[PDB]
């Protein structure tokens, strides 16, 4: 349109990027997508362990999540139900390492009590969860951490350990740092209702894996897709942009959509400088230091669930599969990488054995999202005061647009939020290229 190599370049092949490329490709724009890694998905990654398909990152979807569910209808993708109902064993590991077996009914009842107390005012604070700063109350609450509220709730020891564990997981961090409104807003997105919100958590996966939806969008898009091309700089010039790759290739474009994780912006030079509000976000970054671990054990433990509080590593434990022949594959999410050397098998083994004494570890598979230069962190987790400034992160900068789950209004800790932001970006591109 103005002599550039491309109409639009999308940086990042996660869901935010795939969605944006799809929106732009179908408009008939000459569209390029650049991905730093040699694989697609970003903070979703479909892989294999002990002869079965697994998800190392984002995995779970629901019909109460509007953007991803519509995409699933478009591409004809069904759901797979993970065995999260009628549990056999439910455990809590407290800060000091002691393990308590709770009866599954009681376990469920207690986390319910604690969660409903934590999110008691979600309807008044977030009557419009897709406009987070609609009410003044949402703004004033952003002066508080989740821990500040937790301390006022009068929870039992069990209740407090369960909820702190849950929030540690959501934060990818200790709960003193974790912003209170973010959590409320999410609960609000799931119809301000415990049962509804829980059904969205870790229940339904995408049939064919996350990679299937990514491929379906990129295949639909007609965009050129380049793998193993990290972007190192963006300069605004001649009514478009010059994009520099790590090999010192220069690609010109009318517009660029940045979809990279917030914590990775420091790897990219911008000319001119981004706005001060945006520089603040980039220097703070996003909290989460999460990692993902699968352990195969010989013993058949059936359907298990465990919380560990934030001072212990194995914070969220769930059964991926079980049988007498298989044994059990445990799906474990770790809130803070620092709490466990996830690539040291002797350490992982001892930790698993602390949780389940007398278990025999047949194999492990891990993904350390904090060591990966193209994530440098896990899922989006807002610190105190970040949510109320979110517009700084979203705002167009001349011909640079921004997307990614961090920048979404709704389900910011989810695939759905990435999709949302990609739809926004597609629209902002059209407006610029119109
Ligand atoms: C361990 C883990 C588990 C999760 N589980 C769930 C879940 O169960 N359900 C759920 O809904 N959500 C989950 N999430 C979050 C969910 O994955 C995100 O909300 C969403 O998928 C992120 O999409 P994105 O496109 O914004 O980011 P990303 O997926 O991170 O995409 C960013 C892309 O940019 C690329 N990139 C980075 N730097 C450059 C560069 N310089 N040049 C080019 N490309 C670059 C990256 O390689 C990556 O492909 C999870 C996240 C993690 C980390
Ligand atoms: C999908 N969520 C939102 C942020 C935490 C993340 C999550 C929840 C349960 C398990 N593993 C990861």
Numbering used by the authors: 49 to 482
Q: What does the primary publication say about this deposited structure?
A:
Using this structure as a search model for molecular replacement, we then determined the crystal structure of the NicA2(21–482)–FAD–nicotine ternary complex at 2.25 Å resolution. In both structures, there are two complexes in each asymmetric unit. The nicotine molecule is bound midway between the S1 and S2 subdomains, with its pyrrolidine ring facing the FAD-binding domain. Unlike other, related structures, NicA2 does not have an associated diacyl glycerophospholipid, wraps its substrate more tightly, and has an intriguing exit passage in which nine bulky amino acid residues occlude the release of its toxic product, pseudooxynicotine (PN). Interestingly, the substrate nicotine is completely buried in the interior of NicA2 and is not accessible from the solvent when viewed from the substrate entry or product exit site. Only when the surface of NicA2 was set as transparent could the molecule nicotine be located deep inside the active-site pocket. When the product exit passage was investigated, it was found that this exit passage is blocked by many bulky residues, including W364, Y214, Y218, F355, F353, E249, F163, M246, and Y242. We hypothesized that the molecular deceleration via the severely restricted product exit tunnel strongly hinders the release of the reaction product PN from NicA2. Therefore, the substrate nicotine is deeply buried inside the active-site pocket of NicA2, and the exit passage is too occluded to allow the quick release of PN. Our results indicate that the passage in wild-type NicA2 effectively controls the rate of PN release and thus prevents its rapid intracellular accumulation.
